[PDB]
Amino acid sequence: EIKELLKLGDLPTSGQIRLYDGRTGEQFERPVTVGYMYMLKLNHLVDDKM
Amino acid sequence: VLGLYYMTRDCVNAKGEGMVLTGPKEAERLYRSGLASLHARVKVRITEYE
Amino acid sequence: KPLVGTGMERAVAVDSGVTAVAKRGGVVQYVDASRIVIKVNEDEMYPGEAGIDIYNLTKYTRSNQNTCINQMPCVSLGEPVERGDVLADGPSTDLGELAL
Amino acid sequence: ITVGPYLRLHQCGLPKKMALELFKPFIYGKLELRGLATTIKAAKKMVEREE
Amino acid sequence: SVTEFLKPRLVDIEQVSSTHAKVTLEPLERGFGHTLGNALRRILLSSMPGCAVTEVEIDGVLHEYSTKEGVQEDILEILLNLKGLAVRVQGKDEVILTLNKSGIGPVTAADITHDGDVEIVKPQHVICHLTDENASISMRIKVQRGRGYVPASTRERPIGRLLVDACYSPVERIAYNVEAARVEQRTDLDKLVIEMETNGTIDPEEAIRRAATILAEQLEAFVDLRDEFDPILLRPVDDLELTVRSANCLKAEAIHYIGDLVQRTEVELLKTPNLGKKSLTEIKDVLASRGLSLGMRLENWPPAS
Amino acid sequence: SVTEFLKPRLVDIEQVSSTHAKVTLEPLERGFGHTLGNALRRILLSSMPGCAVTEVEIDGVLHEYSTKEGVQEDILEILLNLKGLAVRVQGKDEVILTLNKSGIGPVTAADITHDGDVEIVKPQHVICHLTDENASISMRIKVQRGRGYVPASTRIPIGRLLVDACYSPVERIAYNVEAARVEQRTDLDKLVIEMETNGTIDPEEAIRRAATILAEQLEAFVD
Numbered sequence A: 001e002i003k004e005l006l007k008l009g010d011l012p013t014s015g016q017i018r019l020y021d022g023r024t025g026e027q028f029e030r031p032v033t034v035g036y037m038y039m040l041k042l043n044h045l046v047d048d049k050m
Numbered sequence B: 001v002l003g004l005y006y007m008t009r010d011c012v013n014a015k016g017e018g019m020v021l022t023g024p025k026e027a028e029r030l031y032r033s034g035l036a037s038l039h040a041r042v043k044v045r046i047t048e049y050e
Numbered sequence C: 001k002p003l004v005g006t007g008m009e010r011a012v013a014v015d016s017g018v019t020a021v022a023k024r025g026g027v028v029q030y031v032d033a034s035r036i037v038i039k040v041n042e043d044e045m046y047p048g049e050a051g052i053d054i055y056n057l058t059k060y061t062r063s064n065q066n067t068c069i070n071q072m073p074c075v076s077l078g079e080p081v082e083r084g085d086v087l088a089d090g091p092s093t094d095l096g097e098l099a100l
Numbered sequence D: 001i002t003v004g005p006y007l008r009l010h011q012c013g014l015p016k017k018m019a020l021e022l023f024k025p026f027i028y029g030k031l032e033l034r035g036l037a038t039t040i041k042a043a044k045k046m047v048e049r050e051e
Numbered sequence E: 001s002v003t004e005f006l007k008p009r010l011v012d013i014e015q016v017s018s019t020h021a022k023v024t025l026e027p028l029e030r031g032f033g034h035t036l037g038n039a040l041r042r043i044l045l046s047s048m049p050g051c052a053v054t055e056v057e058i059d060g061v062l063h064e065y066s067t068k069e070g071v072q073e074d075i076l077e078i079l080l081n082l083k084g085l086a087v088r089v090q091g092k093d094e095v096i097l098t099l100n101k102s103g104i105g106p107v108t109a110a111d112i113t114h115d116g117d118v119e120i121v122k123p124q125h126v127i128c129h130l131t132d133e134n135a136s137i138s139m140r141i142k143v144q145r146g147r148g149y150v151p152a153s154t155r156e157r158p159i160g161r162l163l164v165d166a167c168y169s170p171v172e173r174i175a176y177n178v179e180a181a182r183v184e185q186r187t188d189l190d191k192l193v194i195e196m197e198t199n200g201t202i203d204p205e206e207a208i209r210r211a212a213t214i215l216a217e218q219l220e221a222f223v224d225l226r227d228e229f230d231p232i233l234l235r236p237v238d239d240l241e242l243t244v245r246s247a248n249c250l251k252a253e254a255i256h257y258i259g260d261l262v263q264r265t266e267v268e269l270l271k272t273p274n275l276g277k278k279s280l281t282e283i284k285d286v287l288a289s290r291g292l293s294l295g296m297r298l299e300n301w302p303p304a305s
Numbered sequence F: 001s002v003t004e005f006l007k008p009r010l011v012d013i014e015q016v017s018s019t020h021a022k023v024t025l026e027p028l029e030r031g032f033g034h035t036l037g038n039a040l041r042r043i044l045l046s047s048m049p050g051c052a053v054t055e056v057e058i059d060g061v062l063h064e065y066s067t068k069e070g071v072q073e074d075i076l077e078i079l080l081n082l083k084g085l086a087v088r089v090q091g092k093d094e095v096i097l098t099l100n101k102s103g104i105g106p107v108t109a110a111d112i113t114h115d116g117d118v119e120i121v122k123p124q125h126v127i128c129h130l131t132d133e134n135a136s137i138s139m140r141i142k143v144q145r146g147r148g149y150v151p152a153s154t155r156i157p158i159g160r161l162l163v164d165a166c167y168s169p170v171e172r173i174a175y176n177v178e179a180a181r182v183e184q185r186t187d188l189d190k191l192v193i194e195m196e197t198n199g200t201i202d203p204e205e206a207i208r209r210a211a212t213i214l215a216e217q218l219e220a221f222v223d
Helices: A002-008 B002-007 B024-032 C009-015 D016-022 D024-033 D040-049 E032-047 E075-082 E204-223 E244-252 E258-262 E266-271 E277-288 F032-046 F075-083 F203-216
Strands: C026-031 C035-040 C052-056 C086-089 E009-015 E020-028 E049-058 E087-089 E094-102 E105-108 E118-120 E126-130 E136-147 E161-163 E171-180 E190-198 F010-017 F020-028 F049-058 F087-089 F094-102 F105-108 F118-120 F126-130 F136-147 F160-162 F170-180 F188-197
Touching: B024 F032, B024 F170, C035 C086, D016 D024, D024 D040, E009 E204, E020 E032, E020 E204, E032 E171, E032 E190, E032 E204, E032 F032, E049 E075, E049 E087, E075 E126, E087 E136, E094 E126, E126 E136, E190 E204, E204 F032, E204 F203, E244 E277, E258 E277, E266 E277, F020 F032, F020 F170, F020 F203, F032 F170, F032 F188, F032 F203, F049 F075, F049 F087, F075 F126, F087 F136, F094 F126, F188 F203
Parallel strands: none
Antiparallel strands: C026 C035, C035 C052, E009 E020, E020 E190, E049 E136, E049 E161, E087 E118, E094 E136, E105 E126, E171 E190, F010 F020, F020 F188, F049 F136, F049 F160, F087 F118, F094 F136, F105 F126, F170 F188
């Protein structure tokens, strides 16, 4: 079902694409898994630690 | 470890396979120019000290 | 909102009590960043009363962990509401769903 | 602690806000040594202002 | 010939939309397409100039963690909306715009009072909403030119002036491609196509020219490759109101400045001829009158004069 | 104030050898170290005019995997020795040299017939060794002018051996970016470039020529 939904959006089925280095413009040698993840900021702030 | 392992593996039929090089500097020039593969099997002139 | 969830976000958002939930159905008579006034439906009114509900929202309040508690409206002027609908989102809530 | 990939084996990365407090009497002595401060209170105020 | 490179030129510009463009450079030698493309992308994403909102004053508000009666949004949300206002300034590096509105409805960028040297490229940009008929808003917005990203915390003010983080860069994204060029009689030349996405406040051709100028100015360094004491210490000794015999004793020791005097210890002064304990006590008293003492150590004296 | 950028004030040159150098520049704007370093490295590696040996012919050799009697090295070792020969040609863009030797000892570049236009950078460069006394070596070496590096397999009479052409004088080029600060600004770049050439030109001249090429590539857009 994930592959079908990727097909509906015209995206590669494997979930991996080609990337380029920002500093040089050179392509990385292997496909890379790129997508979206839900991230959280926790209550351990370095302002309260130092 | 992953990077050193990746750079020291060989592939059966890679770009630039079978050429004779004058030394490591020529190998680095060939790799950075895109003319040879990192895993290509070649013959290189090496000087070692004991 | 997570964009990849499980279906339990709305229940957690509503049962926590951090949002404003309509006690009776009606129409949004007044909307503002701090208060909401709902004009109650005729058949949900008690005899001898003025059929309006008023919700005063919580704005930039300190919590037990020294964080911010703030409520924002999620309805527009003149739109219908029903009993149980979300009128305003609390912290970490997006259109009535948990958003951490 | 975070990672420093550029460091040499004998080096560490210290925030300068910590280092300013840690090395305060050394800074006082160095300020008095080269004529920037004539008394201890002048050096103390100069460090407090963080010039 | 071998030492004869073909110089690229700007061929055509395709204005796909008001904020989306394509620029073509042709012809390019073998390998120069990527070399130019990556450097141009980095410079375009890094160093283009633009204008941004930096300060806002609203008549009835004191800080940003508050609300205004009859307004749907918080002050923070209004500031966030104003952070995304695209403005083009034609003649100066600073301007103040005025906004006045009343009545029920959306307050957008088209309600800003007209200015001769100010252009609004997206008049439909929503700023806030007024939900009451007897409600009005009036504010003053400061816009200035710059480059990069300057947070408001890094850069007294009266109560009621609200600071806004500044994102000056007008470029949203850059892409580039290298393709084959069908030149008259060769098949080893390339063509560089640069796709540019901005906010509509900068022309693509001038952006390309500005990036090229910056790159050339940075290159010109490689093209030609080659390799406080305290004031009181600087005052003369006679500034001290020393007695005649004390002054004579200090002159006999070749002491002409306070910095010379304070470095000498009490023992050395005592051992000097013609100087008793009374005169040394007087010298200590006059030094103490200015918060100085004998026995101080200094590095690099005399002070190079 | 928006069109002005920092420029390097310290340019330190360390001369490791006559053909090996380090150049340090600072301060730079954030991110410009990688830009300049990558551009210069690409130009030095891939596009640099020079003269190089292209192909050879030996009377007693008809194939790469052939046997030559009286010489210590094999054919591919002779080709490797020829690939590392540094020359300067100022007359034209294609010259042919002849090498004839006999006896016992090291046959070097100094045994090549002299020519007014051609020059040998390192006469001590060893071509081969002659072991037997009644052994003679005769060969013809073609030198051409070009740019960069051209592998011999991309170009695939009798007895003609193809040699990889190394036109660029650059043997090695690398760069690194480090931190640097002015008293107020702290996140600035510092560029270190280490490069070695073959001896035809000095590394500083190579850097200047690469920078000149890049600057001339931009003349249509620079204001």
